[PDB]
Symmetry: C5
Subunit: 204 residues, 5 copies
């Protein structure tokens, strides 16, 4: 219930402590989802963008940046990776959807679709998650790793319990996202832990 429109979280340093917890009242396992957000980082090493863990389940839903031009999604421990030509460093808009019935994961980078990949067909992503920005969880809420920490800025984060069609991905990219029912940047419940600063978004 905080509207962060026009603002970003800044993770201004590398650490094993700095992070934001995102709170969602999700109690039903997910068959489908889409996650979109905007990020600006000049890290060359790998890092976690979005870490969603549940009780007894590490890497239940994880968006991980392997290196420049390579984006990975983990579902239930398994992963897929797709490549893109991108400038570095540069602000980026990232969406990824996943659909249990087919296992298909769709990444979109700056409104451009990456090659589809597939994993975990028939799997249900569990609910009552702990969701962390800034660090990658290895436990339910913790066990961070400095070498996976995100340094930079994140904004405009939305998560839906459905697979967005292309037009709705583009809406989000263009700054007019459709209402989101899992996480909503315009009505976000979060906890800052450590050194995270909220600043205006100046790089769009």
């Amino acid at each position: 219930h905080t509207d962060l429109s026009g603002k970003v979280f800044v993770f201004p340093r590398e650490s094993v402590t700095d992070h934001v917890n995102l709170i969602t009242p999700l109690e039903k396992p997910l068959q489908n989802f889409t996650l979109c957000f905007r990020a600006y980082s000049d890290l060359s090493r790998a890092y976690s963008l979005f870490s969603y863990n549940t009780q007894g389940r590490d890497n239940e839903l994880l968006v991980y940046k392997e290196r420049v031009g390579e984006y990975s999604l983990y579902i239930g421990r398994h992963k897929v990776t797709s490549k893109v030509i991108e400038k570095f460093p540069a602000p980026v808009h990232i969406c990824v959807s996943w659909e249990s019935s087919s296992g298909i994961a769709e990444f979109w980078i700056n409104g451009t679709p990456l090659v589809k990949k597939g994993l975990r067909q028939g799997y249900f992503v569990e609910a009552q998650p702990k969701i962390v920005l800034g660090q990658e969880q290895d436990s339910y809420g913790g066990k961070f790793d400095r070498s996976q920490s995100f340094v930079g800025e994140i904004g405009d984060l939305y998560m839906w319990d459905s697979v967005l069609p292309p037009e709705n991905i583009l809406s989000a990219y263009q700054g007019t996202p459709l209402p989101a029912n899992i996480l909503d940047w315009q009505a976000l419940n979060y906890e800052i832990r450590g050194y995270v600063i909220i600043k205006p978004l100046v790089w769009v």
Copy 2:
């Protein structure tokens, strides 16, 4: 008899099992043909795009991607290769024609002609093929190789028993192909085997 307009086959993972069989009424050997399709893959290793084998004849008609920027056509186990400047990764539209009387092979990449090459002048491509997408055949219908598997998306596949002139190549590229009499994306008989998913084409 299936209309796949606006859809693609997604081969969402590397494997030695996942493939699509394409079924054609072909009992007469081929003197002339054109084959067009659209593909999107972020593999950098080599892979088969279109594998056509006949009884006792490996690589009877094979479209094979050597590496970024290099496309090969095999006719009757002989091969030619032509080069092109292309982005990686990127969607591509590929056409290739071959004419027995001259032996000339013409590749067209995104509506741009590659340098013509020639092979097997006077040869007839054998009939009663097994045609496979997703894997490269070494037997009549099988003996696949994981290191040659296609991971990504293929759509808009057409095959004609004639050599198309440039305007019809361009028309296919532009999404208004001439009706095709060997294989036709709008009236396709196919068999999915293993993990292959049909999805909307979102990258044109």
Copy 3:
């Protein structure tokens, strides 16, 4: 009290001793500041752009170019670094701000914001500085290092005791800078030491 409009300092050679002292009656420690200037150098080795030391304190406020595309700010010996795509050699406009309350350092290169970083939250930059262009200080006013010397041209330098908003940054870059209260190019007090020549600015 000198108007350097349309002029630059030229540091025309590598040396250990050529430099300009910038004089400001700065008696109270700084909680906030912004520094903007234009520079043109074809050095590929590291160099100091702006060196501010106080008695007994090295690198109290230092803007340092590590290598092409990498800009560093030191506050009380601690540093942050941010990256940018830039041409080399090329003239550049650089602004950097820092805010004690948040620790946030903002670099802007040719009116483009770099990724925010953060350091020294709650700190105050010490007053009574010696401020040097052309050389990096390791003592209070001296102990230079030719391998860190700046060779090239600097102009349009301003320093304010506040964090400028983006509109004021862009005005400095391409419009009328807001008059500045610590250092101001239209009313600058300076001392030339060694081989430094004032010339018209010809590269904007």
Copy 4:
């Protein structure tokens, strides 16, 4: 005489056999000449573009591609080479002129002049040539070398017994060449030997 307007010779494979003989009625030594043609090849090794030998005299007039971006002219066994930034692979339009009185050779690539070079000032290129496309001659009409063979397509070839000024070079590049008196694509006397196929020009 044959009008090859809108057509090309296709040398579809590497060989020591495949070539075209061109026949001119001139029957005089050459003091001045210009030669223009279009070519499209994806060879990265060296190759002969135009080979003119006379009785007992190798490399009497030879246009030879050393590697991407490097064009050589031999006159009377001596050579010059000039460089250009060019795309690879790509269609190219090539003109070269030579003037005995000055020795000056001018290459023009896609209507752009390369650096002038000079050779054989005062020499007369011998009369009664054998002129070959597709292979490099080492004898009067033969002694080819597969490692110097041209694989690809050639069209729009014209040769004049004078040095064309820039405006006439550009006319040739644009597809409105002045009528030519040594060799003329619109009234060409030629002999195909081995595997050379005439096809429509599809790459302009």
Copy 5:
């Protein structure tokens, strides 16, 4: 007293002999000068562009190209070098000025200023020079070096006994140079020695 408007000197081969002597009415030592000319060469090795020697003094005023993207000026055997982004091979317009009072050398490449450098403050360039294009002098008029020879084309050369302001540099670049009192392409006294050919300028 020869008007070379629209023409260039072509140095069509590497040699230790080919050169042009430029003859000037200059008789007093030089405190200030500007030298502009256009050049086109595809040499990648080092070479001399303009060699001005006086009795007993090598490298009295020398414009030397170290390698692509790097231009050097020698005054009285001392050297400065400045860098630029340039295409290779490509025609270039080069101006360089030097002012004894400050020691400042200003290179301009295609109307774009390079970083200023400084040398020989207070020095007077000696009079009664021998000025050579095509070779680098090590004696008063001679002692050439094949590995420093200029191969290619030079035109539009002007030398003034003052430091030109930017507007006048740009005029020369654009083809409307001010009349020049040391050397002037429209009223030039020169001696061709060896293989140098005058041709029309075709690459502007």
